[PDB]
Scaffold this motif. Structure first.
Motif, PDB file in Angstrom:
ATOM      1  N   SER A 109       0.963  -1.193   0.037  1.00  0.00           N
ATOM      2  CA  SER A 109       0.048   0.145   0.028  1.00  0.00           C
ATOM      3  C   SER A 109       0.866   1.405   0.062  1.00  0.00           C
ATOM      4  O   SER A 109       0.459   2.345  -0.698  1.00  0.00           O
ATOM      5  CB  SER A 109      -1.055  -0.068   1.233  1.00  0.00           C
ATOM      6  OG  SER A 109      -1.678   1.273   1.399  1.00  0.00           O
ATOM      7  N   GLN A 110       1.747   1.335   0.756  1.00  0.00           N
ATOM      8  CA  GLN A 110       2.841   2.585   0.810  1.00  0.00           C
ATOM      9  C   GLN A 110       3.966   2.707   0.135  1.00  0.00           C
ATOM     10  O   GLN A 110       4.660   3.357   0.490  1.00  0.00           O
ATOM     11  CB  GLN A 110       3.120   2.535   2.447  1.00  0.00           C
ATOM     12  CG  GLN A 110       2.148   2.499   3.289  1.00  0.00           C
ATOM     13  CD  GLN A 110       1.187   3.835   3.262  1.00  0.00           C
ATOM     14  OE1 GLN A 110       1.781   4.965   3.361  1.00  0.00           O
ATOM     15  NE2 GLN A 110       0.033   3.663   3.092  1.00  0.00           N
ATOM     16  N   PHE A 111       4.032   1.822  -1.073  1.00  0.00           N
ATOM     17  CA  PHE A 111       5.171   1.735  -1.645  1.00  0.00           C
ATOM     18  C   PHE A 111       5.936   2.966  -2.190  1.00  0.00           C
ATOM     19  O   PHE A 111       6.889   3.482  -2.174  1.00  0.00           O
ATOM     20  CB  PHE A 111       4.962   0.872  -3.016  1.00  0.00           C
ATOM     21  CG  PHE A 111       6.203   0.810  -4.063  1.00  0.00           C
ATOM     22  CD1 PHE A 111       7.421  -0.022  -3.629  1.00  0.00           C
ATOM     23  CD2 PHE A 111       6.223   1.598  -4.875  1.00  0.00           C
ATOM     24  CE1 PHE A 111       8.215  -0.155  -4.642  1.00  0.00           C
ATOM     25  CE2 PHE A 111       7.278   1.340  -6.065  1.00  0.00           C
ATOM     26  CZ  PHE A 111       8.220   0.492  -5.733  1.00  0.00           C
ATOM     27  N   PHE A 112       5.079   4.055  -2.688  1.00  0.00           N
ATOM     28  CA  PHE A 112       5.358   5.216  -3.101  1.00  0.00           C
ATOM     29  C   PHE A 112       5.827   6.268  -2.192  1.00  0.00           C
ATOM     30  O   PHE A 112       6.411   7.381  -2.465  1.00  0.00           O
ATOM     31  CB  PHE A 112       4.125   5.910  -4.147  1.00  0.00           C
ATOM     32  CG  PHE A 112       4.278   5.197  -5.488  1.00  0.00           C
ATOM     33  CD1 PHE A 112       5.049   4.835  -6.208  1.00  0.00           C
ATOM     34  CD2 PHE A 112       2.583   5.186  -5.886  1.00  0.00           C
ATOM     35  CE1 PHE A 112       4.977   3.861  -7.496  1.00  0.00           C
ATOM     36  CE2 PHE A 112       2.524   4.379  -7.292  1.00  0.00           C
ATOM     37  CZ  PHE A 112       3.736   4.097  -7.914  1.00  0.00           C
ATOM     38  N   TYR A 241       7.680  15.100  -6.386  1.00  0.00           N
ATOM     39  CA  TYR A 241       6.937  13.856  -6.863  1.00  0.00           C
ATOM     40  C   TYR A 241       5.583  14.038  -7.579  1.00  0.00           C
ATOM     41  O   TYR A 241       4.775  14.864  -7.020  1.00  0.00           O
ATOM     42  CB  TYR A 241       6.757  12.810  -5.611  1.00  0.00           C
ATOM     43  CG  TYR A 241       8.289  12.845  -4.970  1.00  0.00           C
ATOM     44  CD1 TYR A 241       9.010  11.734  -5.271  1.00  0.00           C
ATOM     45  CD2 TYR A 241       8.464  13.586  -3.797  1.00  0.00           C
ATOM     46  CE1 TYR A 241      10.412  11.509  -4.591  1.00  0.00           C
ATOM     47  CE2 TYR A 241       9.585  13.413  -3.030  1.00  0.00           C
ATOM     48  CZ  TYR A 241      10.634  12.620  -3.532  1.00  0.00           C
ATOM     49  OH  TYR A 241      11.712  12.249  -2.603  1.00  0.00           O
ATOM     50  N   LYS A 242       5.502  13.624  -8.844  1.00  0.00           N
ATOM     51  CA  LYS A 242       4.025  13.752  -9.296  1.00  0.00           C
ATOM     52  C   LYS A 242       3.528  12.171  -9.574  1.00  0.00           C
ATOM     53  O   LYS A 242       4.270  11.351 -10.328  1.00  0.00           O
ATOM     54  CB  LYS A 242       4.242  14.503 -10.851  1.00  0.00           C
ATOM     55  CG  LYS A 242       2.843  15.080 -11.077  1.00  0.00           C
ATOM     56  CD  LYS A 242       1.886  13.991 -11.856  1.00  0.00           C
ATOM     57  CE  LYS A 242       0.590  14.882 -12.383  1.00  0.00           C
ATOM     58  NZ  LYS A 242      -0.255  13.871 -12.608  1.00  0.00           N
ATOM     59  N   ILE A 243       2.224  11.780  -9.147  1.00  0.00           N
ATOM     60  CA  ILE A 243       1.723  10.471  -9.223  1.00  0.00           C
ATOM     61  C   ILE A 243       0.653  10.489 -10.287  1.00  0.00           C
ATOM     62  O   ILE A 243      -0.143  11.444 -10.289  1.00  0.00           O
ATOM     63  CB  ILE A 243       1.359   9.936  -7.953  1.00  0.00           C
ATOM     64  CG1 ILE A 243       0.807   8.548  -8.012  1.00  0.00           C
ATOM     65  CG2 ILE A 243       0.379  10.776  -7.122  1.00  0.00           C
ATOM     66  CD1 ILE A 243       0.830   7.745  -6.787  1.00  0.00           C
ATOM     67  N   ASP A 244       0.877   9.607 -11.179  1.00  0.00           N
ATOM     68  CA  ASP A 244       0.033   9.680 -12.386  1.00  0.00           C
ATOM     69  C   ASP A 244      -0.503   8.267 -12.777  1.00  0.00           C
ATOM     70  O   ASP A 244       0.044   7.339 -12.800  1.00  0.00           O
ATOM     71  CB  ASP A 244       0.769  10.192 -13.637  1.00  0.00           C
ATOM     72  CG  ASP A 244      -0.085  10.599 -14.779  1.00  0.00           C
ATOM     73  OD1 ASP A 244      -0.774  10.102 -15.244  1.00  0.00           O
ATOM     74  OD2 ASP A 244      -0.402  11.811 -14.786  1.00  0.00           O
ATOM     75  N   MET A 267      -2.762   1.045 -14.191  1.00  0.00           N
ATOM     76  CA  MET A 267      -1.466   0.947 -13.537  1.00  0.00           C
ATOM     77  C   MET A 267      -1.246   2.360 -13.079  1.00  0.00           C
ATOM     78  O   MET A 267      -2.054   3.243 -13.235  1.00  0.00           O
ATOM     79  CB  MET A 267      -0.433   0.637 -14.549  1.00  0.00           C
ATOM     80  CG  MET A 267      -0.297  -0.798 -14.911  1.00  0.00           C
ATOM     81  SD  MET A 267       0.871  -1.120 -16.352  1.00  0.00           S
ATOM     82  CE  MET A 267       2.505  -0.651 -15.739  1.00  0.00           C
ATOM     83  N   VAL A 268      -0.188   2.543 -12.239  1.00  0.00           N
ATOM     84  CA  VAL A 268       0.192   3.840 -11.686  1.00  0.00           C
ATOM     85  C   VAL A 268       1.637   4.100 -11.805  1.00  0.00           C
ATOM     86  O   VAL A 268       2.448   3.139 -11.961  1.00  0.00           O
ATOM     87  CB  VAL A 268      -0.156   3.966 -10.114  1.00  0.00           C
ATOM     88  CG1 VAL A 268      -0.070   5.360  -9.776  1.00  0.00           C
ATOM     89  CG2 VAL A 268      -1.738   3.719  -9.903  1.00  0.00           C
ATOM     90  N   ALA A 269       2.253   5.173 -12.065  1.00  0.00           N
ATOM     91  CA  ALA A 269       3.543   5.723 -12.102  1.00  0.00           C
ATOM     92  C   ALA A 269       3.937   6.653 -11.167  1.00  0.00           C
ATOM     93  O   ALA A 269       3.124   7.798 -11.062  1.00  0.00           O
ATOM     94  CB  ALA A 269       3.855   5.920 -13.321  1.00  0.00           C
ATOM     95  N   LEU A 270       5.091   6.832 -10.351  1.00  0.00           N
ATOM     96  CA  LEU A 270       5.654   7.896  -9.802  1.00  0.00           C
ATOM     97  C   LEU A 270       6.706   8.395 -10.701  1.00  0.00           C
ATOM     98  O   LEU A 270       7.394   7.874 -10.893  1.00  0.00           O
ATOM     99  CB  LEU A 270       6.139   7.560  -8.367  1.00  0.00           C
ATOM    100  CG  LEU A 270       6.344   8.519  -7.440  1.00  0.00           C
ATOM    101  CD1 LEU A 270       5.261   9.245  -6.649  1.00  0.00           C
ATOM    102  CD2 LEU A 270       7.553   7.855  -6.362  1.00  0.00           C
TER     103      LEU A 270
END
Lengths: 292, 59
Positions: A109-112, A241-244, A267-270
């Protein structure tokens, strides 16, 4: 297509909840760290300069005014203060971390958040290796190693009392006095068995601190020294940091060769970026000892 | 002692009689002259309380 095996990726940087053998990574235990992660040795040794654009202008005093002895009623002569101009520009560091939303929901859950210290370490190491060693395709065209190559201010020889003192003396020819040493820990050995000139208790060489570079590019026989207040750095942008959740990533490809689309593929990317700048204020202030 | 920093080298590699940590030679302080006229091989010492100065006009 109704295909339910997980996607294979190239270069395969995507974090995934299901392994290709069908193992599902539930009940996952958050990774702990075997180390304390490194600060930037440039930021430890060098001088910080407040910077607000991506370029900075320096003016340094260069000539001091004179003075005269004057008899009673003799003419006082005139003199001049001089300065020299210099400038530094910033460049951008960045990384992207892609993750599947299954992984982000069910595995970690907290990876980013837990990645942020590791991204900072990656930027600090990239900056140090660029500005000190001139390695990792540095952008600045300025470095310690390139200054030493330009001035040819190099000793060829083994670690000896003579060679270490001659290295320090090679700065003091220019009235500059060494402020630290840069080493690779693999060569503490060569500093221990010379006679003492070194101690590990303070980790000091002949009274100066030794700073260790945690990198593969500084070889066994190599030692660096300088007046590190002549190395100046600045940071126009602290790490952002931008999360997209919907970008394409062209630098990662599906097994079919297509770019990765985060919306179609769920999917998600940081993205992390930082702007950072380096200046070598006096290229004579650094010297290197190198094996024969 | 009065020295030129260009000759710390010659004080380091003699055996120790000198240390840079205090910048002392055989227990006395070393003072560095930032000038071009004191040459490499040259070292000065004295009882510097025998040197007296005065300043009738501050700058």
């Amino acid at each position: 297509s109704n295909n339910v095996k997980p996607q294979v990726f190239n270069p395969d940087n995507v974090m995934m909840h299901e392994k290709k053998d069908g193992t599902l990574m539930n009940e996952f235990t958050t990774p702990i760290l075997q180390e304390v992660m490194e600060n930037s040795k440039i930021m430890q040794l060098g001088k910080y300069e407040p910077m607000e654009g991506t370029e900075k202008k320096f003016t340094f005093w260069a000539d001091k005014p004179g003075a005269y002895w004057v008899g009673e009623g003799q003419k006082i002569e005139t003199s001049k203060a001089t300065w020299v101009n210099a400038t530094m520009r910033a460049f951008k560091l960045g990384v992207i971390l892609p993750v599947t939303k299954e992984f982000l929901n069910y595995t970690y859950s907290q990876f980013f958040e837990e990645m942020k210290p590791m991204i900072a370490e990656a930027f600090y190491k990239k900056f140090d290796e660029a500005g000190i060693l001139n390695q990792g395709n540095n952008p600045f065209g300025k470095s310690i190693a390139q200054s030493i190559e330009k001035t040819n201010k190099v000793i060829k020889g083994d670690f000896t009392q003579d060679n270490i003192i001659d290295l320090e003396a090679l700065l003091e020819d220019d009235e500059l006095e060494a402020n630290a040493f840069i080493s690779k820990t693999q060569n503490r050995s060569l500093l221990r068995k010379i006679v003492r000139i070194y101690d590990r208790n303070s980790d000091s060489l002949d009274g100066l601190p030794v700073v260790n570079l945690k990198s593969s590019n500084l070889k066994r026989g190599e030692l660096i020294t300088g007046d590190f207040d002549k190395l100046i750095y600045g940071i126009p942008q602290l790490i952002e940091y931008k999360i997209d959740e919907t970008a394409q990533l062209s630098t990662v490809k599906n097994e079919d060769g297509t770019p990765v689309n985060l919306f179609e593929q769920d999917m998600v990317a940081l993205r992390a970026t930082m702007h950072v700048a380096l200046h070598i204020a006096d290229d004579k202030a650094f010297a290197k000892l190198v094996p024969a």
